[PDB]
Amino acid sequence: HEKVTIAPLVLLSALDHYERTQTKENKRCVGVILGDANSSTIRVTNSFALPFEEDEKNSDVWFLDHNYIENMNEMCKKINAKEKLIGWYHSGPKLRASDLKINELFKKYTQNNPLLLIVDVKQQGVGLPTDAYVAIEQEKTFLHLPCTIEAEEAEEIGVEHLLRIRLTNQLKSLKGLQSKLKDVVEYLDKVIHTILGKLQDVFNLNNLQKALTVKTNDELMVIYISNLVRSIIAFDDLIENKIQNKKIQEQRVKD
Amino acid sequence: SLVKLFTTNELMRWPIVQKTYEPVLNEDDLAFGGEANKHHWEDLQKRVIEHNLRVISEYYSRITLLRLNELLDLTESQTETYISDLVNQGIIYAKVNRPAKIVNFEKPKNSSQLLNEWSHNVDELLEHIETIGHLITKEEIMHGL
Amino acid sequence: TLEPSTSITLAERQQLAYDLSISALLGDKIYNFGELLHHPIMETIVNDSNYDWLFQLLNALTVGDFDKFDSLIKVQISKIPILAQHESFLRQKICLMTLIETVFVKNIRMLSFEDISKATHLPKDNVEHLVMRAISLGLLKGSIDQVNELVTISWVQPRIISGDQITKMKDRLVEWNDQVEKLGKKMEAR
Amino acid sequence: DAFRLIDTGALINNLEPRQTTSNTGLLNKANIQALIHGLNRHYYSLNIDYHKTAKETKMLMNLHKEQWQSGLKMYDYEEKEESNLAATKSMVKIAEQYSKRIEEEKELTEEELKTRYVGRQDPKKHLSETADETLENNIVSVLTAGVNSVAIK
């Protein structure tokens, strides 16, 4: 399949247009990603906003200027020639009816399958403040591609200069069953099987490990054998340092 | 149907099929020399037995030797003849217990268990957070509209 | 899903349901006739004149009575013995999907020769051959143990049923939550 | 790096140098040390800091760590580390083999306990190589082993 690679330059750029424009919950900042969608690895090296206006009274009313779309994409070619139109990004926590009608706009100048991106300034719950989706039809069918972040050498190192485990893993793992339980109950009363079929595939696949439980305990003992030997090595240094500490005390008594 | 037969072949209908339709099977006078049809009966039986034990390894992990002799249309002495050639030539492998009359698959443990075979359990929850995260937004679309 | 297109009257719906029904008689793949009931078909067609095969064969895969369906049909489809063979697969596949997690509580996968013989209404000799033919068709996987009377079948064919997995999924939620208060708070309060 | 011109003027104003580590010129050494006094012109004395809002600081702290396995650490690196655990068990054994061989030759050649040996700190280097490496190999076989199973039911 394909994967979406979002550079930290793009994630931080979309967060800037939200605060500078004083965008409230009634508006969502829309922008255009730039990159190469030809290969299986989709990387976005550039992002910019657009004068978008949102209307909550009518989902079919949106203000977008196509002149600024083609001009800015042409003027930014002088920087890097690898930047083309692979899709667009927009703000807001949720996908409303106005987002479905604006999907067919950029598809005229886009060759391959466009890429959609949702930027969340609040980042409420779990991970992934920016979720990526693909727009394709047979009815609109959206698929969530794996979201990864990879930058250049100077870009990844520059983040560390500006900033100069097990418990968290168990908390998010427990919340996965709580969030899935609410999705099944709400969908049960919504119908009164296709959506629940995909969740049943993952949920079904000492229950099945009973055959490997005997062989698992034998491997855990071998792991402790290495840990027991390394523990003795650390214990020898404690006695060696205790004798070494006395040599310093013996010099303090004579001198 | 004869090509796909070897997978499901129990050798129960083997004598029945050869009698009704025998174009190349039992009696063949074309492009085959011989003094009788006994060569067609011996040569065809050698192939259906080798393919019979081959699919058992992929289906029956443990089977009684007494039941295996009835499925192979052989005897105690004739069963050990055909299986000895399959293992010696490096085709397949099986378990033969003469005093215990037990025939098993003999699953190799050389894979070091958890050190390798655990790769089947990583794909179980790989689609867990991915499918749920996609349905959270999808369900809210139909609920809001 | 087609809302706007494929204009059809009640005359062609019965002709369309004919090819949809007969496809599932010998079809061993993708659930069973109940999928045709999930779509607005049976409600739009007549309930008799050999259009009721969906209702008769629905419970025939549970109770396992072949005299109810064979008595109401003609000699056209009853002459082929293959039709009676495929009805035995879908009857057992309902119970074989319960081996890991659907209904059963302890979620331990084990099957003997006696328990499966009473559910499929078949003896111990015919049930061993029925499972081998089911895996050979690509519907199932796994192995079979005749020494200890154990049947291990890998989960392949999905199902559209639901509502029985909510309670058993809570078992993983409650049992793992106890370690958050005990083991989870032990490492945090370190 | 930056540059700003001064020429005539820019004086009779606030204090430019006193801000950050200015009033310098010990020997010739500053920055690239091709500059001394003039730099480009007049030693503008650049000061490079950074300030971010509450939303921007919340991102890079949780987002940037090493790579992205995050949100579930259990099964992502479980199969990758367990598959190489068989080879890791054999490689950590060689590290211990060369451990005591250094300490054995260390105390064998010294009957004095003085320094002719230009050994000013001899022991602590080889002692830490037998400690920190041992301290590295055991913790990765324990802390990871706790989440290596965690199966329960």
From Swiss-Prot, chain A:
Entry keywords, A to Z: Acetylation, Phosphoprotein, Proteasome
GO CC terms, sorted:
proteasome complex; proteasome regulatory particle, lid subcomplex; proteasome storage granule
Domain spans labelled MPN: 4-138
Q: Does the keyword Cytoplasm apply?
A: no
Picking any one GO molecular function of the record gives: metallopeptidase activity
PTM field: N-acetylated by NAT1.
Source organism, top-level taxon:
Eukaryota
What GO terms in the biological process aspect are recorded for it? proteasome-mediated ubiquitin-dependent protein catabolic process; ubiquitin-dependent protein catabolic process
Please verify whether the record's keywords include rRNA-binding.
Answer: no
- Anything else of interest in the record? Present with 19800 molecules/cell in log phase SD medium.
Chain's role = Acts as a regulatory subunit of the 26S proteasome which is involved in the ATP-dependent degradation of ubiquitinated proteins.
Instruction: Give the similarity note.
Output: Belongs to the peptidase M67A family.
What is this protein's name? 26S proteasome regulatory subunit RPN8
State the organism of origin. Answer: Saccharomyces cerevisiae (strain ATCC 204508 / S288c) (Baker's yeast)
UniProtKB/Swiss-Prot annotation, chain B:
Leader sequence residues: none
All residue ranges annotated as the PCI domain in the record: 1-110
**Similarity-based family:** Belongs to the proteasome subunit p55 family.
**Could you name the domain of life of the organism this protein comes from?**
Eukaryota
Q: How is it modified after translation?
A: N-acetylated by NAT1.
Name this polypeptide is given: 26S proteasome regulatory subunit RPN5
Q: Which GO terms describe its cellular component?
A: COP9 signalosome; cytoplasm; proteasome complex; proteasome regulatory particle, lid subcomplex; proteasome storage granule
Q: Which organism is it from?
A: Saccharomyces cerevisiae (strain ATCC 204508 / S288c) (Baker's yeast)
Miscellaneous note, as given in the UniProt record, is: Present with 5710 molecules/cell in log phase SD medium.
Keywords from the named record = Acetylation, Proteasome
Biological role: Acts as a regulatory subunit of the 26S proteasome which is involved in the ATP-dependent degradation of ubiquitinated proteins.
Q: Name one GO biological process term.
A: proteasome-mediated ubiquitin-dependent protein catabolic process
UniProtKB/Swiss-Prot annotation, chain C:
Mapped onto the parent protein, the portion here is: 198 to 387 of 393
Query: Domain of life of the organism in this record?
Result: Eukaryota
Q: Where is the signal peptide?
A: none
Q: What extra comment accompanies this record? A: Present with 12400 molecules/cell in log phase SD medium.
Q: Per the similarity annotation, which family is this?
A: Belongs to the proteasome subunit S11 family.
**Domain spans labelled PCI:** 1-158
Q: Which organism is it from?
A: Saccharomyces cerevisiae (strain ATCC 204508 / S288c) (Baker's yeast)
Q: What is this protein called?
A: 26S proteasome regulatory subunit RPN9
Described by its record, this protein's role is as follows:
Acts as a regulatory subunit of the 26S proteasome which is involved in the ATP-dependent degradation of ubiquitinated proteins.
Q: Which gene encodes it?
A: RPN9
From Swiss-Prot, chain D:
Q: Which GO terms describe its molecular function?
A: cysteine-type deubiquitinase activity; metal ion binding; metal-dependent deubiquitinase activity; metallopeptidase activity; proteasome binding
Reaction equations catalysed = Thiol-dependent hydrolysis of ester, thioester, amide, peptide and isopeptide bonds formed by the C-terminal Gly of ubiquitin (a 76-residue protein attached to proteins as an intracellular targeting signal)
Q: How is it modified after translation?
A: N-acetylated by NAT3.
Any one GO CC term of this protein is: proteasome complex
* This protein's record includes keyword Magnesium: no
Q: Which residues form the signal peptide?
A: none
In short, the EC number is 3.4.19.12
Keywords for this protein:
Acetylation, Hydrolase, Metal-binding, Metalloprotease, Protease, Proteasome, Thiol protease, Ubl conjugation pathway, Zinc
Judged by the first EC level, this protein's enzyme class is hydrolase
> Function, please?
Component of the lid subcomplex of the 26S proteasome, a multiprotein complex involved in the ATP-dependent degradation of ubiquitinated proteins. RPN11 is the only catalytically active member of the lid and serves as the essential deubiquitinase of the proteasome.
Report the sequence similarity comment from the record.
Belongs to the peptidase M67A family.
**What does the domain comment read?**
The JAMM motif is required for the deubiquitination and degradation of ubiquitinated substrates.
Q: How does it assemble?
A: Component of the lid subcomplex of the 19S proteasome regulatory particle complex (also named PA700 complex). The 26S proteasome consists of a 20S proteasome core and two 19S regulatory subunits. Interacts directly with RPN8 and STS1.
What miscellaneous comment appears in this entry?
A: Present with 16400 molecules/cell in log phase SD medium.
The UniProt gene name for this protein comes to RPN11
Q: Which residues of the full protein are shown?
A: 154 to 306 of 306
